[PDB]
């Protein structure tokens, strides 16, 4: 076997991909999440998945107003959490309630209480970051995309979350081959990207914005995309709408 970065080296213009995305879409980086406990960050990330930004934010507001401490959510059970989520709008309330409840119940029974503060105590070394990743991945229902998001957003650890928008753009740019699944795409990005948190955070913020707002699934805005000169797919889309 062979590292993904050797099977698939980044292009000569990779640095310009990073800098043009940052300059165009995130010239001033937003703050990462600094919640009292990473458990709150994890739950906030769960609310964001398969959801609009507006609904996820309303749900966070309503959920935390309803349950000022997570102990109250655990007592109210998945039915209570579901009702709370449903009241703020948005679907998948039953799925999300079960998922959140399962995390809380696991933490209470086996981790001494409703907290993920222990994630902050692992060393800030590649070995410690891997422990933090493994601990998030050991929570019931928590998949790799959410693990990467919590590491990057809540823990200041240099994971490399790649959302579906970013992946679509990466495949159109031919940064990664079409057949690679989302987890393999994340692994490739984590191998090739500069190791530092800030660069990785900047790519995630700017890449999500680019993929959502420019490299749209139907009708991408190639003429207005700063990556057009590097992109093998632009001509197909441009000539197509003509």
Per CB under 6 A, does 88 bind ligand SF4?
A: no
Question: Which C-beta is closer to ligand SF4: that of 190 or that of 234?
Answer: 234
Site string for ligand SF4, 122-161 (x = CB under 6 A): ----------------------------------------
Closest CA relative to residue 63, chosen from 43, 39, 36: 43
Alpha-carbon distances, residue 63 vs 32, 56, 113, 165, 208 (angstroms): 21, 10, 19, 27, 25
Burial of 10 (0-12, 13-18, 19+ CB in 10 A): middle
Cα(220)–Cα(240) distance, integer angstroms: 11
Element (H, E) at 109: helix 93-110
What's the closest the beta carbon of residue 169 comes to ligand SF4, in angstroms? 5
Place of tokens 């900047």: 202
Using CB under 6 A, pick the residue from 234, 239, 241, 242 that binds ligand SF4: 234
Per CB under 6 A, does 166 bind ligand SF4?
A: no
* Binding residue count for ligand SF4, defined by CB under 6 A: 15
Question: Which C-beta is closer to ligand SF4: that of 31 or that of 232?
Answer: 232
Contact 4, 193 (CB under 8 A): no
Contact 21, 29 (CB under 8 A): no
Per CB under 6 A, does 18 bind ligand SF4?
A: no
Per CB under 6 A, does 176 bind ligand SF4?
A: no
Per CB under 6 A, does 170 bind ligand SF4?
A: no
Residues in the chain: 242
Using CB under 6 A, pick the residue from 225, 239, 240, 242 that binds ligand SF4: 225
Per CB under 6 A, does 206 bind ligand SF4?
A: no
Q: What is the CA radius of gyration of the chain?
A: 19
The answer on whether 225 is annotated among ligand-binding residues is: yes
Per CB under 6 A, does 212 bind ligand SF4?
A: no
Contact 106, 139 (CB under 8 A): yes
188's tokens: 């490739």
The answer on whether 48 is annotated among ligand-binding residues is: no
The binding site consists of 215, 222, 225, 231
Positions that interact with ligand SF4 (CB under 6 A): 169, 172-173, 214-215, 220-222, 225, 227-228, 231, 233-234, 237
The binding site for [4Fe-4S] cluster consists of 215, 222, 225, 231
């Amino acid at each position: 076997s062979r590292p993904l970065s050797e099977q698939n080296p980044p292009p000569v213009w990779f640095g310009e991909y990073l800098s043009r995305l940052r300059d165009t879409y995130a010239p001033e980086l937003p703050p990462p999440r600094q919640f009292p406990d990473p458990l709150g960050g994890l739950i906030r990330t769960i609310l964001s998945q398969q959801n609009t930004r507006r609904v996820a934010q309303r749900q966070w507001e309503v959920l935390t107003a309803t349950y000022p401490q997570w102990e109250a959510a655990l007592l109210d059970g998945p039915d209570g959490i579901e009702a709370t989520l449903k009241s703020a709008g948005g679907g998948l309330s039953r799925m999300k309630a079960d998922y959140i409840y399962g995390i809380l119940a696991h933490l209470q029974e086996h981790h001494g209480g409703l907290s993920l503060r222990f994630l902050r105590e692992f060393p800030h070394t590649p070995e410690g970051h891997e422990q933090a990743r493994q601990a998030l991945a050991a929570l019931p229902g928590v998949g790799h995309k959410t693990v990467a998001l919590v590491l990057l957003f809540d823990l200041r650890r240099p994971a490399m979350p790649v959302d579906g928008n970013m992946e679509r753009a990466a495949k159109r740019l031919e940064l990664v081959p079409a057949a690679w699944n989302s987890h393999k795409v994340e692994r490739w990005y984590a191998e090739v990207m500069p190791a530092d948190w800030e660069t990785r955070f900047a790519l995630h913020i700017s890449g999500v914005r680019h993929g959502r707002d420019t490299c749209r699934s139907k009708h991408p805005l190639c003429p207005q995309c700063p990556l057009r000169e590097f992109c093998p797919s632009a001509s197909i889309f441009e000539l197509g709408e003509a």
